[PDB]
């Protein structure tokens, strides 16, 4: 097949400017997210921190949809820059710089908790079972 006998040569350019900053949006493979299920998405900087440093908040499907939180990686160009390489209709390659790395993870909308009450809970549990002994 062409992956075995395939051969080719293409030109690479690195434009000194772009119309938009380029970032990486990373997902855990273990989740195997079906992007087709994403009818829509909202994407906003996280509000816990109340800008460029702000973690992202991703809300899939507008109103009723999924939600992820994206946390910035420590470094992205500390030793080596990361580039996005894109194929163009002329076959030539275009390279785009990676501005930032954000880590996206899934969120658990159910199961709310209040440790104040749960602290008393663990003590009571550590008391009732300790009582009525022998």
């Amino acid at each position: 097949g062409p992956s075995s006998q395939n051969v080719t040569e293409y030109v690479v350019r690195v434009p000194k400017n772009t119309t938009k900053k380029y970032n990486i949006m990373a997902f855990n493979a273990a989740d195997k997210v079906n992007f087709a299920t994403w009818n829509q998405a909202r994407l906003e900087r996280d509000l816990s921190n109340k800008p460029e440093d702000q973690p992202w908040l991703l809300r899939v499907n507008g109103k009723s949809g999924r939600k992820f939180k994206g946390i910035k990686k420590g470094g992205v160009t500390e030793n080596t820059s990361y580039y996005i390489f894109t194929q163009c209709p002329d076959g030539a390659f275009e390279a785009f710089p990676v501005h930032n790395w954000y880590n996206f993870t899934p969120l658990a909308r159910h199961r709310t908790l209040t440790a104040e009450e749960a602290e008393e809970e663990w003590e009571r549990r550590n008391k009732v079972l300790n009582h009525f002994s022998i």
Partner: protein, 707 residues
């Protein structure tokens, strides 16, 4: 080309090459040249500026200089002092110290006015004799006699108020590693420890325990669930469950926490043990309430909420494991290491790995003059900057101006070092009660072999009357690195010890060039990997820090050893351990490890051919010496830790002959087994014929013989 049974004259011709170059007190002279070329420049360079204020001012230090030791006469005319006048006139042998300071005024007054005052006087540092900064460096015997000095004097001591002081190397427990003990008296059934210090930059060293409570806790409640893993962080009052401190770093989910702690989910025996750790920590199930829980009990109980969430943020960020990373970023590393610390505590409870040994001599480090004066110079440079502010603020509120040559109190560094050296207590003058005593005693000049046996002496800092025998008995690991026969009687039996003849203490280096080689030799970083590709990989540590994994360890180990054989890229003083069973690889570069050379052995033959001998008996007019012998890969320095993964032969002509043989995979060979004795114990004829306590008496008795 081989050396058959000409061995008895061949082993004594390489040992002559060793002592002709190194000498007997290179221990002392090399740690000093380090403290004064690097360890002093870094201290002033890595210091916070003193921005202060309307206008505001700048001050920062750039470069340090020194001059040859000098004495200021009665009328202010300087002159170089020779070491002899320092003894006769009860002077002190020291050298002045300068620095470059730059001062910029920032008032946004449409101009940033900067100015600098270079070579500003600071103080005076003592100078160890025969160093690279002494007046006797590199002189010939015709000139050493002309200044009334002895050409045989070894050097390696200070002259302070006429006296001659010598610094005693102090022992110390190794840092940045995990040790598992078992206190059989207290509530804990197991315990871990890790003393951390971020590359010679912190006055204290933060220590963190990871305990586990006892099984026989009398109480029906805890009887069923079992023991709960606890942690005792620094700067907090109360114990903390581990799942709580895990969530304070993020990682609130319990599928993500239990993959930093357990590396393979086909193990039901371990997962059962960590289950009752979640039940009690199924309380703080979100981040901010967790920070409040740990933030509630500190050195200051927070009255408000935001301060506790602030207070708990840095203590968990700048006091927890500072050796991994202190930046507020890269907090996935502090999670893995804290996971490895707990994964290793469970292995000690299922009985899959043995507990660590306290007196195993591979867990110890030695503090020479270098790492001792540098520790004492920090506490007196901060103390010098703390009192430029007090003089600037009092002087800038009136708004007049500023002048710095009058701000520097020069008596801080001069009288600071000179005091503690002369009297011994390793502290401050108003701190004659909080210091460690017994360092810096007076050189012994009774006989010439009592002088040499003083510049080579260790000291374990445990008490001098404790009846516990295990810090006093002879460890087997002391083979070849500490003299077995020489020790004093009385109350200090086994507490002070002398090191063997060829034992060599390392000086230290930077791990930068090995890390840059490791990443380009197919080592996956920790961040960009999945925690399921960790079961069949060998975790690679470097200097105490987990820095990746690797799916092919042995080739790397042999390659590294081979590189070390020529020391091609690796300072020949780094040790590289690989333990096949626990499936990891360790690398060390720090200062304090104790080494000794051995002979490298290939398949079953030595690597020292005859071509190396007939050109080594000619060093006088050939310029071929010990250094050209290490750089050719026939000898090699072997640490104590690395000495557990090695197979030694005592003598070539007798242990490396094919037969029905003991072993067949010898990796090294000794030079002569007589180099396991100290200085005062190697003047005894036929000591292999006496009873053992007799050899101890003479070694403590030839130190007081007239000559």
């Amino acid at each position: 080309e081989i050396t058959p049974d000409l061995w008895q004259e061949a082993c004594w011709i390489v040992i002559s090459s060793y002592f002709d170059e190194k000498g007997l007190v290179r221990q002392q002279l090399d740690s000093f040249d380090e403290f004064i070329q690097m360890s002093v420049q870094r201290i002033v360079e890595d210091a916070p500026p003193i921005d202060l204020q309307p206008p505001r001012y700048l001050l920062k230090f750039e470069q340090i200089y020194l001059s040859k030791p000098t004495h200021w006469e009665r009328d202010g005319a300087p002159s170089p002092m020779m070491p002899n006048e320092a003894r006769l006139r009860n002077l002190t042998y020291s050298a002045p110290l300068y620095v470059d300071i730059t001062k910029t005024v920032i008032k946004e007054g449409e101009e940033q006015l900067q100015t600098q005052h270079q070579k500003t006087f600071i103080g005076k540092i003592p100078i160890m004799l025969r160093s690279t900064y002494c007046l006797l460096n590199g002189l010939t015997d015709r000139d050493l006699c002309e200044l009334n000095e002895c050409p045989l004097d070894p050097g390696g001591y200070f002259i302070i108020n006429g006296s001659e002081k010598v610094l005693i190397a102090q022992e110390k427990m190794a840092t940045n590693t995990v040790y598992v003990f078992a206190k059989k008296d207290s509530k804990y059934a197991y315990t871990g420890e890790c003393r951390s210090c971020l590359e010679n930059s912190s006055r204290p060293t933060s220590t963190i325990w990871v305990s586990m409570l006892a099984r026989g806790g009398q109480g029906a409640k805890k009887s069923a669930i079992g023991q709960r893993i606890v942690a005792t962080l620094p700067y907090i009052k109360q114990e903390v469950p581990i799942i709580i401190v895990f969530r304070a770093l993020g990682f609130v989910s319990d599928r993500d926490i239990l993959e930093h702690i357990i590396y393979d989910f086909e193990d039901p025996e371990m997962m059962e043990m960590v289950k009752p750790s979640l039940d009690e920590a199924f309380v703080i199930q979100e981040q901010n309430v967790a920070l409040n829980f740990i933030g509630s009990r500190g050195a200051k109980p927070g009255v408000t909420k935001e301060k506790r969430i602030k207070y708990a943020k840095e203590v968990l960020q700048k006091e927890m494991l500072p050796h991994v990373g202190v930046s507020d970023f890269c907090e996935t590393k502090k999670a893995y290491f804290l996971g490895y610390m707990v994964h290793r505590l469970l292995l000690a409870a299922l009985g899959r790995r043995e507990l660590d040994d306290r007196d195993h001599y591979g867990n110890k480090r030695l503090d020479l003059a270098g790492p001792l004066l540098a520790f004492l110079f920090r506490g007196m440079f901060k103390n010098l900057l703390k009192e430029v502010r007090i003089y600037a603020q009092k002087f800038i509120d009136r708004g007049k101006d500023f002048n710095l040559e009058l701000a520097i109190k020069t008596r801080i560094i001069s009288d600071g070092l000179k005091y503690s050296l002369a009297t011994g207590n390793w502290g401050d003058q108003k701190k004659a009660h909080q210091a460690r005593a017994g360092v810096s005693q007076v050189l012994n000049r009774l006989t010439f072999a009592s002088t040499l046996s003083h510049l080579r002496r260790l000291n374990s800092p445990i008490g001098r009357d404790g009846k516990l025998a295990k810090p006093r008995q002879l460890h087997n690991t002391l083979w070849g690195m500490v003299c077995p026969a020489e020790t004093p009687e009385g109350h200090a039996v086994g507490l002070v010890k002398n090191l063997a003849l060829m034992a060599y203490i390392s000086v230290g280096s930077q791990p930068s060039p090995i890390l840059e080689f490791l990443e380009e030799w197919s080592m996956e970083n920790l961040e960009e990997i999945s925690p399921a590709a960790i079961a069949d990989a060998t975790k690679i540590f470097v200097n105490g820090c987990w820095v990746g994994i690797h799916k092919d360890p042995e080739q790397l180990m042999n390659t590294l050893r081979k590189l070390r054989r020529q020391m091609d890229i690796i300072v020949s003083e780094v040790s590289m351990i690989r333990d096949i069973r626990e499936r990891e690889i360790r690398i060390y570069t720090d200062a304090g490890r104790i080494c000794r050379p051995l002979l490298i052995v290939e398949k079953q033959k030595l690597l020292l051919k005859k071509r190396h001998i007939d050109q080594l008996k000619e060093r006088e007019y050939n310029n071929y010496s010990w250094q050209d012998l290490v750089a050719s890969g026939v000898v090699e320095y072997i640490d104590t830790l690395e000495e557990e993964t090695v197979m030694l032969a005592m003598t070539p002509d007798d242990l490396q002959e094919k037969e029905v043989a003991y072993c067949s995979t010898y990796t090294h060979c000794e030079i002569h087994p007589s180099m396991i004795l100290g200085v005062c114990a190697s003047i005894i004829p036929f000591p292999d014929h006496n009873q053992s306590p007799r050899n101890t008496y003479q070694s403590a008795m030839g130190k007081q013989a007239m000559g």
